[PDB]
Design a protein around this ligand. Structure first.
Ligand code: ADP
Length: 244
């Protein structure tokens, strides 16, 4: 993983201590800051490392589909949900704050009882899953508004990993930019990355990176491609490809 910023190193140290626990971990961070990567690090550093790592984006599914994707539904005889698929392993729920209140209630019940309720006939399913969740919402604010369950937060938020946005990671922007530029040079067969000019560095370090590391990679790849030479340093950082 790339980065030297104290804020980021401190996250890695925190994760090394949290991973062996069976307790739920809440990751607060912006898109592209490595939420899923950290969730997967928690899994692979934990005693569950040989078990499944399953992900789901709560924001991507309507309420009824989220409900059946997480908790499963009947009808060859059953469509297992993500809790069942994660049994013995880890389930990463991204965009937690978008889960509808009915889902939040059902999530609290699974955490506190350790089983998934079942329609008549079939008995409840036991599940044994280590949960990691993420969002950039202000969850305490949502609790005040009535849009996030306080009880659920008392279960999910055993501890909180705060992932710093790229704009708050010291000089990690240039370290990562260089790394990404070099890999794009290999992809388009340039013999050497010719460096970034001061203008390019100013552009990179002054931009907010709303898309963080995902956005940085894309911008840098496009910029290297457009430059297309090892003869002269890269000067033009193409943040916005919709202008020109
Ligand atoms: N510290 C890091 N070093 C190298 N690549 C990283 C680092 N953090 C995140 N990335 C990369 O950034 C992209 C977004 O990370 P990911 O965890 O998927 O995103 P998100 O925060 O949106 O869940 C991925 O391609 C991932 O490899």
């Amino acid at each position: 993983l790339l980065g030297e910023a104290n804020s980021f190193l401190e996250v890695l140290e925190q994760v090394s201590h949290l991973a062996p626990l069976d307790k739920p971990v809440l990751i607060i961070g912006e898109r592209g800051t490595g939420k899923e990567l950290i969730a997967s690090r928690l899994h692979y550093l934990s005693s569950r490392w040989q078990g499944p790592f399953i992900s789901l984006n709560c924001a991507a599914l309507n309420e009824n589909l989220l409900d059946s994707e997480l908790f499963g539904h009947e009808a060859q005889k059953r469509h297992p949900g993500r809790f069942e698929r994660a049994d013995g392993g880890t389930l990463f729920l991204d965009e937690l704050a978008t889960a509808p209140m009915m889902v939040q209630e059902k999530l609290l019940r699974v955490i506190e009882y350790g089983e998934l309720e079942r329609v008549g006939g079939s008995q409840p399913l036991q599940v044994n899953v280590r949960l990691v969740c993420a969002t950039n919402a202000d969850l305490p604010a949502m609790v005040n508004e009535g849009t996030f369950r306080a009880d659920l937060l008392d279960r999910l938020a055993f501890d909180v990993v705060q992932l710093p946005p790229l704009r708050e990671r010291e000089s990690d922007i240039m370290l990562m930019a260089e790394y990404f530029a070099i890999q794009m040079c290999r992809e388009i067969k340039l013999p050497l990355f010719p460096g970034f000019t001061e203008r390019a560095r100013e552009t990179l370090l002054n931009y907010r990176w709303p898309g963080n590391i995902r956005e940085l990679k894309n911008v840098v790849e496009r910029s290297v491609y457009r430059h297309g030479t090892s003869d002269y340093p890269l000067d033009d950082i193409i943040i916005d490809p919709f202008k020109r």
